[PDB]
Amino acid sequence: NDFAALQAKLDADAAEIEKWWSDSRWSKTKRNYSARDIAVRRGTFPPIEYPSSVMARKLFKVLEKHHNEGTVSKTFGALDPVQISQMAKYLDTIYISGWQCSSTASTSNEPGPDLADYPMDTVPNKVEHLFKAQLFHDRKQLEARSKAKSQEELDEMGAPIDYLTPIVADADAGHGGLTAVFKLTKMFIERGAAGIHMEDQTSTNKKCGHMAGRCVIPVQEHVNRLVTIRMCADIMHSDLIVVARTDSEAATLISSTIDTRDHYFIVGATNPNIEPFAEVLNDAIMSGASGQELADIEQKWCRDAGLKLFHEAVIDEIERSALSNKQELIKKFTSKVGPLTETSHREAKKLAKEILGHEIFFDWELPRVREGLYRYRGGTQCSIMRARAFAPYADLVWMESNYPDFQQAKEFAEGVKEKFPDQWLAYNLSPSFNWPKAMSVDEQHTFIQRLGDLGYIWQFITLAGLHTNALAVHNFSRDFAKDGMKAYAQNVQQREMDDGVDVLKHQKWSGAEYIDGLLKLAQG
Amino acid sequence: NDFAALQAKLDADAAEIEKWWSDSRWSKTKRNYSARDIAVRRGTFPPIEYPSSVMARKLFKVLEKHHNEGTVSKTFGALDPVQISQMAKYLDTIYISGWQCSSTASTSNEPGPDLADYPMDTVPNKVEHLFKAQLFHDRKQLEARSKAKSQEELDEMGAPIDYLTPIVADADAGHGGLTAVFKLTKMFIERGAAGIHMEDQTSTNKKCGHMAGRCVIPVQEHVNRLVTIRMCADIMHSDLIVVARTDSEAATLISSTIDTRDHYFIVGATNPNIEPFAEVLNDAIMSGASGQELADIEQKWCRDAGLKLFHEAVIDEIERSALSNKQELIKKFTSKVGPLTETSHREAKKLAKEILGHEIFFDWELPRVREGLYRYRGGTQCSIMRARAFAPYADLVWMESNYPDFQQAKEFAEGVKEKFPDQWLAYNLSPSFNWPKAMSVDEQHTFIQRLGDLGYIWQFITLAGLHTNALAVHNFSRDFAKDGMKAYAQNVQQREMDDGVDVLKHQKWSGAEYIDGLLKLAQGGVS
Amino acid sequence: NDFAALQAKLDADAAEIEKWWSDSRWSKTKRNYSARDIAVRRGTFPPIEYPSSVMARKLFKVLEKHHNEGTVSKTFGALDPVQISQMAKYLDTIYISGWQCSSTASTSNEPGPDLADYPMDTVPNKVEHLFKAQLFHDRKQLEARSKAKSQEELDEMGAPIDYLTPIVADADAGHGGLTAVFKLTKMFIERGAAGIHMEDQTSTNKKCGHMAGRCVIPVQEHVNRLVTIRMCADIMHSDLIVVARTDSEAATLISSTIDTRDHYFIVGATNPNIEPFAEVLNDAIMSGASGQELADIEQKWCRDAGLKLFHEAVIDEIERSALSNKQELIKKFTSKVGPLTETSHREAKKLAKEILGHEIFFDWELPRVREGLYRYRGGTQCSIMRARAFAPYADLVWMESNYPDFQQAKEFAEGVKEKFPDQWLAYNLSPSFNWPKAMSVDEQHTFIQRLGDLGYIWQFITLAGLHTNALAVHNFSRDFAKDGMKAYAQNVQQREMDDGVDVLKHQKWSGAEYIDGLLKLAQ
Ligand SMILES: [Mg+2]
Ligand SMILES: [Mg+2]
Ligand SMILES: [Mg+2]
After folding, report:
1. Which residues does the Swiss-Prot or TrEMBL record annotate as the active site (chain A)?
2. Given Cys at both, which of A115, A441, B77, C448 links B97, Cβ 3.0 to 4.6 Å?
């Protein structure tokens, strides 16, 4: 129970951590705490190197190389060990999709649409599922190749597959408060994630309807998430890659107005003579309005309330006013109050009054939906503001897109790179989009490399594992019902033979010779 | 704490159970205990109807119909919810493969070759995995169709998919003793299995090597497994279908000689001057012999030892004696001592001595391998003997085959049906066989219906889910690395559009509208 | 694919559901949807009777009987199968504590303090853990008793233990949005919960500091949670008991001002010249103030800002005005604007202006903490307001208390019962309170019955399973290290013998004879 020895131990631990943090891997990484803050929080067990951290360091070097050479790590969302066993041959990262987990892999076995409302261990369990398969196939392959007696015999086995393919996994929106974020990160690190991504949505107001809309959280609240991930990683001595995703491009709601950076984008009513939306909608339900009647009331309320962003409200009032030099007043205002200027509403009100000589009515409480969420006009510029705020706390940033648009992706890349010219970018290639019909074959073929030239060094089709599986098993079910073993022979087996799929020899692929060898060793 | 009230309650429970058991579903089912034996063992909780038992009754009807009409329920092993969501459109049963589970679905997340050495909750967990997906997609689809406001609107949605596709699941070899068999069965029933299959292998001596060989257990030991499955089902009031599988067709070993029905097939040494195999092989290892030298010594020991079946040993001795009417003596012997006669070795020794006038040397301890397992000559007739023994305790029987052989499948079917003319048969369609090369296209096309005409009413490709997934994800990985989104557009999306794969609309398929509907219902209420 | 057949099927399903809902079990239950709304959502599988629903019906009857007779179902939080196997002998309900689960039972095996940040399957898994143990011991016991050949042999075995003890389980705050609430409820019903409780806290701003404070959600948001639980239960044909808990008695924060019922209680600044708290605290951190300096600045800001409830601000302004008959005016205002009147801030502003002849500054954005949460003055009356709102959607209501106070429990009971005279109440008996020191032995002895006479028909010590285990295993660890097998002989075994603990015969208790019997039957 020696006090001075404890202080000395912690100071030395702190210095080991400081030294770690001086590695070049961390050159862009902002930390909101000290080395000693971490030392006092990580217990007395010898520092563990987690296998995931090995893969994290490999992932960093893979991505760094793509960045330097202007190329792309392409991947897609993997379902299962079969899939990663094939992907390993052709791809240099693996993605794990929370969407695919919700439909195929919840730890409660209750499936459903993508709401991140499976139990929080679901995606970490999928990480373990794939990671331990990777390690197994790695062991199997080494043992097989160790049996070669000459260079020629080794050549006959084929080039080795690199099964140790770093995994980046969906951490959704944290699955609760910051303590959940911490525990989630811990599971991911324990179970084999080289990196994870977390998005600036709520965990309490997620929606899945087609028309439904989408709520984000205040900028700082997501920053604190990212800080908490890195804190857990620091406590566990992991080099975990962190991907910050913003969903603000199509956000229509925000959970709170507390962050001044958000204020530009928050929608207010300019009609002081209208009742609050929430109370109106509630009154209408109380007298038993139908679902169509409620859509009518809402759409008319929004029209009559005069919903605007504040800068629009101000500019509109200036154009109406008796003032001279309107165009130059507006240019002055707009240079102080813009999507990227992060001007607080208080500051913008001051400037507005100085110009108009009075205070215009603007109220962003009135339009709140019944859950209390504020109306919010998301878009590309909003996403740039947010990604810029996230960038110090994230190794890659990512604007969620539902529509592949080169120009918008250019605008986001350049917007971010204006403040962070070396920022790594990620891009999701939307599986909802009608690729075959809505862009030319040649554009399909080049799309990824063109985004690669913009600095999108990691790109992935979230749902490809799901779709390739669905197509193949649909077609074989159909063809098997019709043609029996002929369908298997021609549409599965022959194709496996032609394409050189190792699973064809399913006993060997599964590791039968590997385990047989363990048996022989033990009974020798 | 009234004694008479308890006796009366249990007698009434017994009579409910007796009445259940008189249902025609049970007409071929032999039970080795009474209704009251079960009543006293099932607790005081109201009898539960398990969802799995609903599916079991549906499965029985599906299979009964195929049997009566001479057709086949075709299926294959399913990996995941995506697969069963597509299979439900075209197939009337689902199979769950322990092979696929060991490579893709162990509850420890440690994969490997098919040794049933994942934790025993693995295949039951896979059942739940697929079953709850079935129920979810059923809920989703009903809700979607409920929105149709006219016959024409409903027609536009298409025919309904039957997502409630009965599942038959691999229960391996029981994962231990009879108490494990019981617990395994319980999990399966709780988690949604319409039927399970269990095989007469060991759980302690399973092998995976290419040439490795294969041990079975004594006939009665597997019978007791099947009895234990049915006992659990009876305790839980489930109509669970039970499939008895024998792996004896290519068995080379048996774990014990205790069952007299096995005796015909147990290999003995006829040379009384040879050392025990196990001790010879051990000595050779201890002198540092190489892996090839050990295969040489084993093959040499087997020929020096004069390994044969007893009836062969006897016939050989008769032919090499000085006796009259050898062919008639041999016919007399073989009519009493045959693969299907279930004659004990003692009885066969007695007949042999009555014919030859002396006792011949025959020792089946000497050939035992180092684990102590006996050498055993499996084959079609062996499988018939075993399936016949299993049949009273099983709704289907199944001879595991690695090689699709029409003539052998005919022999097994007829051999079993001679004693059990109404017996349902199952057949596995080997995914390792080279179908494209070793059968004409026409033979491929007809194979299943040809076995169907023999009474194989349930046939399945164990590993088809694995292979279709592997092929598609291999090809896309290759093509995606090369051609990027062009590959996705042409080789996935366009094909999904052309083939009418509902998953293409992935939000709707996943049930986004269903859950959106729950949200609206819950928030459609007043302050 | 016949349209008319589908409509007819759904109408018939709807009518079965309507019949179910006409049972007297549902007499106080408000439903915000129709029978057919449920019919179209529950799929084409035959209706399942879940074992949990059987236990729910038993639980309802147990609680109804206690209510009618003025008695109490006593229980406490159970850890494991050993515990419920003993509890079954003496108690008529079982409680499962989320607190105990976070320390002992997370499905990730990562423990920690009570933040409901284990994976959401954690408490449902604990339900299954205990429920399947109950069923097993029930089977064991029936088989054992079936071997008695006469009344005398049966008497020798003792009275039967009722192992089928209905379980009420902690559903925390829903573990996310309403879709999570739904999925959580579904697991609970599948895995054997006779009832669950859910509380009006956030799932995103939970705190554990002794310091720390406590955020609730808007009234309606929790109502919607309770509606969603009942909706899931209706889809699954379960009689599941629902307990609505409010944590508003010691709440200091609320997540949003959207619900007009909350407005009375929301703290506002009355000083129109003060900077926003969040921006002040941020500026102070950016200058690198220490943890003591920041505590100083917060308390200084709260002073300078003039934090009050609106009705206080109004009363203060009246006392400081030149108006006549101040006491009459204040009484008029407070009679229209009170904790239970659910008066919107707009309405209260209107009355205030009518009295004072001007509008007073009152701003509840300014005091928000940095996460954006509003300052909120919780208390007994707040909890009454909320429990009243919950009551139509809940079979029991429950004001979370950390201090056992008869008078406060009386106020809450009577406050609720004034609007809902048949409302069942639940009470948690605090394990953090110093019972031995801070009330007399006689008061200890009567406390539960005295609350029972107020209508608290279900009362439980959340953490008792944890504490009895901790005490016993601490003491044996100590004594075993010192005295070896002597400690085991005297402090465990002899005591087990004296007290008649069946586990002493551990083979028999574990069900060795039961399973041996299954073996015999098969062989
Ligand atoms: Mg996702
Ligand atoms: Mg198998
Ligand atoms: Mg709790």
Report:
1. 208 (proton acceptor)
2. B77
Computed on alpha carbons and rounded to an integer, the radius of gyration of chain C in Å comes to 27
Q: Which two tokens stand for residue B238?
A: 């489930």
Is the CB of B468 less than 8 angstroms away from the CB of A492? yes
Measure the CA–CA gap between B234 and B53, rounded to whole angstroms. 11
C31: left (phi over 0), alpha (psi -120 to 50) or beta: beta
DSSP letter, residue C398: E
Which ligand has the nearest atom to the CA of B173?
2
For tokens 């928030």, name the residue.
Answer: B523
Contacts of A35 (CB under 8 A, 6+ apart): A14, A15, A17, A18, A21
- Minimum CA–CA partner of C275 in chain A: A346
Residue of A273, A297, A275 whose CA lies nearest to A284: A297
Residues 6+ apart with CB under 8 A from A312: none
Residue A160 tokens, joined: 């080795």
The two tokens of residue A507 are 């006993």
Say which amino acid occupies C14.
A
- Burial degree of C247 (CB within 10 A; 0-12, 13-18, 19+): buried
| CA A345, A346, A348, A349 torsion-angle sign | positive
The residues of B annotated as belonging to the active site are 208
In sequence order, the β-bridge partners of residue B196 are B169, B242
Give the HSE-up count for residue C191: Cα atoms under 13 Å, Cβ half-sphere.
Answer: 20
Six-digit token string for C244: 């609505």
- Could you count the other beta carbons within 10 Å of the beta carbon of residue B294? 13
Question: Measured at the alpha carbon of residue C139, what is the angle toward residues C138 and C142, in degrees to the nearest 5?
Answer: 85
Could you list the beta-strand ranges (E) of C151-254.
167-170, 195-199, 215-216, 241-246, 253-254
How deeply is C439 buried, as exposed, middle or buried, from its count of CB atoms within 10 A (0-12, 13-18, 19+)?
middle
Among B46, B145, B518, the residue with its CB nearest the CB of C54 is B46
Q: Which H/E stretch holds residue C21?
A: helix C3-21
Tell me the CA distances in angstroms from B17 to B20, B227, B237, one per residue in order: 5, 17, 8
Find tokens 């990824």 and name the residue: A448
What is the whole-number distance in angstroms between the Cα of residue C197 and the centre of ligand 3?
Answer: 9
User: Rounded to an integer, what distance in angstroms lies between the CA atom of residue B477 and that of residue A91?
Assistant: 7
What residues make up the domain containing A306?
260-375
CA-angle at B388, arms to B224 and B424, nearest 5°: 100
Q: Work out the minimum CA distance from A147 to partner chain C, whole angstroms.
A: 40
